[PDB]
Curated annotation (Swiss-Prot), chains C, D:
Fe cation 2 binds at E51, E94, E127, H130. GO terms for biological process: intracellular iron ion homeostasis; iron ion transport. NCBIfam families: bfr. Belongs to the bacterioferritin family. CDD domains: Bacterioferritin. Its cofactor is heme b. This is Bacterioferritin.
Length: 159, 157, 158, 158, 157, 157
């Protein structure tokens, strides 16, 4: 029982998205943490653990197909300065992952595995359920205005 | 005992208001749910369930009068895009109900049954307790301003 | 992402089945309770709310596809007088559900969305459990006889 | 210490009755479950596991006599469609077991083992305790009539 | 609504795998029960009930398709003497199941049922989650050695 | 108050060791997880999370110095096949971190900050409490021999 290496690569190209998404959420989480924009920092910190949960079940599956996880390669990572830029860039990153997950399942359905597609749809169902929130968030600032939007995301701590 | 048919349609035209008001509340409750306006979405879900409670006690009464509920015919339903139009539209819907309910009871009390008028006033007492609320709500946006009014209706959760 | 309207209308014609099924279940639930037929009216009221919430998970899907729910148009609704007629009627109503749902998902799997079809099977799996039950119930009346079948559906509770 | 192969086979001929009886009870338990005949399906599922508890202690016993359990051969299994003949069919299956077990224990007492026939009587006290019950059941249908007898075993589900 | 017989037989040949695997797991569990290798027999008894859980949901499906379960005929069942042979033979039995499951779901997906394939994948997901553990165990012995592998399976209790 | 840039890369070259260390632990932890080498797999998962506790306060330090964390580039990561190779490889990785931590604090004390060096010693106390343990582990195999050493790592559960 050996996985077809393209299907393995179809798993593997998903994996490079995982490691980059860990750091770009977490540093931005640590970015706003100094910036005091408090409740949104609580969101992306709790969000980042789900991709840790997303990546681990990915990691087991290729071992069931007797694969070799490359944790060495990486994609390019970006940073922003205001949150709109932070909300615009990762959208493309979330726009990046879907089509790869889209194009993977149609071909892997043609090649007789069922179980790895069940992994692939499940993570794909998360991100479409994820990206809309950002799409909800951005204009909700943008129609309203950033300053009053900034005026509600902060609070003084409990010393 | 047989229900008088004139009273029966007076119950019935109220029922047509009920089913239409269910959907126009609920979809607009689901509309702001996507639009992140969290707290009023909790409120509009709470308003919809009372009309669901309003309709069932309406429903059994005509069966006591041995009637046939038309759950088939409806009235025209509208939608809005900002909240103010939604607050303007349902006002007319609330303006639609009361005067017709005002029309029914006097004619009903003229014809010797008491019991459905008790249902009439009880359902009237809610909407007169309801129509003023949005009437207070809309000017409170309008005097103040919509953008800051939007600045308190959301929640990141 | 914008939903393809052929998927959207196929979501939409499911919705028209949903609203009509609410009223025909509930009124017939409000039929037999006056008729004393108690536990099936408990069952029919219990049958309503699952079919209710089936439409809500239908509803929230199409706004992700940026759609406009027609909560205005309906299908034709029927009533009966004895329960056998009701059990014959809703069978056809459930007979209308599956094949159209069967007609959809093949095309939906043919057109590069997966996520909506998971709802499509999920609403299907319920009515698989539903249509046989009423199919079971009718022969129980028919092999036995209606009168003794009425002789177990009523209690002294009012 | 080695078991005498006749006694082993006489233990073994019980075992063929065991696995056959498990399926013929369980499918009928699943049959009336689809047929809605509720409490008998509760009773048939409950009666089946005692036979599962029956067969396992037989399986250890031949290992104590250092035997080889044939889990391969099976006797012929039947099925019906009405409820009555199922009570007639298993009666013969109940009639099949006892006399052969009656044939054994005399020979078991004839040949200097005590312990295996203790299992034989322990299972035989069960098989008498079944055959009377179904015999009590069937005439109670038969004197009364099937339809009113059927008119008490179905009840609604949750 | 009637089940298609080619779908039905595909359920049916799966069923023959069930009853054979029940006895071969259970007796070999009862084999090491004499042989004092208790913790794997604890593993074997708990594993055997899950196939009994797999078999009943197989059974109720076909009567929804209005089918007739053949609980009558079976396939050939084997026995071993050391555990490696027991680990080698059931692997083939697990190798027997999955391709037949692979052969079924491709065809019935072309033939307009969805629901029984959901049953088929669910048991198929178990066996691929099963057969690796067999494959994990057997190489772990022969790399290490059998006698020390025997040196960890008794309990004296 | 601005961080002196020489301090910043000396924080940063520690950081490049950090992200590489998590994966080489975890994948090898996931390697033995398939291999049934479970009790040390429990240990290696515990080793991963402490490094996350080490790396975060490192990241919190540099923003006080107004720094830019390069989470982008890495160092070279290796894999092994038997545990001795794994215990030999990470030893060098443990040997890699200390001298950089050693060469830091002499300069960190030399240039009028204490607080970053307080982090620098606090991380350094961990690996000296760590590299001895793995050094103890490998020789404990080495006198003994791998097979009997492996013969206690299996749980069968
Ligand atoms: C101060 C707290 C934490 C920090 C700074 C942190 C940070 C990180 C980072 C940077 C990664 C990516 C490294 C990698 O993927 O190998 C990661 C992965 C992970 N962490 Fe955390 N984490 C924290 C809390 C936790 C806790 C408390 C747990 C478990 C009880 C946990 C479980 C995991 C898991 C399962 C992964 C995925 C492993 C992997 O994909 O390689 N994390 N964490
Ligand atoms: C003709 C009468 C009614 C109609 C048309 C109606 C309609 C609905 C609808 C559309 C939903 C959304 C479910 C979904 O999206 O899946 C719902 C939910 C619900 N229904 Fe009704 N309803 C009616 C009467 C009632 C009444 C009077 C009650 C209870 C006293 C009730 C019990 C419920 C409850 C409790 C929920 C909320 C379930 C939840 O929050 O999880 N229904 N109903
Ligand atoms: C929730 C509890 C149980 C379930 C779902 C279950 C399931 C089943 C079913 C349905 C069968 C019949 C299949 C057939 O023979 O065609 C079976 C066979 C069997 N049952 Fe169970 N059973 C349960 C309890 C038990 C227990 C607790 C034991 C033993 C301690 C047991 C012992 C057996 C044996 C040994 C067989 C195989 C018969 C043979 O090899 O001849 N059962 N199992
Ligand atoms: Fe993901
Ligand atoms: Fe009302
Ligand atoms: Fe439904
Ligand atoms: Fe027995
Ligand atoms: Fe299975
Ligand atoms: Fe560290």
């Amino acid at each position: 029982m050996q996985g077809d290496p393209e299907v393995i690569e179809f798993l593997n190209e998903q994996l490079t998205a995982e490691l980059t998404a860990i750091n770009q959420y977490f540093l931005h989480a640590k970015l706003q943490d100094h910036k005091g924009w408090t409740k949104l920092a609580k969101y992306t910190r709790a969000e980042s653990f789900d991709e840790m949960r997303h990546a681990e079940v990915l990691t087991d599956r290729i071992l069931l197909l007797d694969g070799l996880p490359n944790y060495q390669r990486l994609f390019h990572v970006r940073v922003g300065q205001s949150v709109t830029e932070m909300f615009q860039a990762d959208r493309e990153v979330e726009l990046e992952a879907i089509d790869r997950l889209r194009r993977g399942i149609e071909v892997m359905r043609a090649k007789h595995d069922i179980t790895s597609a069940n992994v692939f749809e499940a993570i794909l169902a998360d991100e479409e359920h994820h990206i809309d929130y950002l799409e909800t968030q951005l204009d909700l600032i943008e129609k309203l205005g950033e300053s009053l939007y900034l005026s509600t995301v902060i609070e003084q701590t409990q010393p």
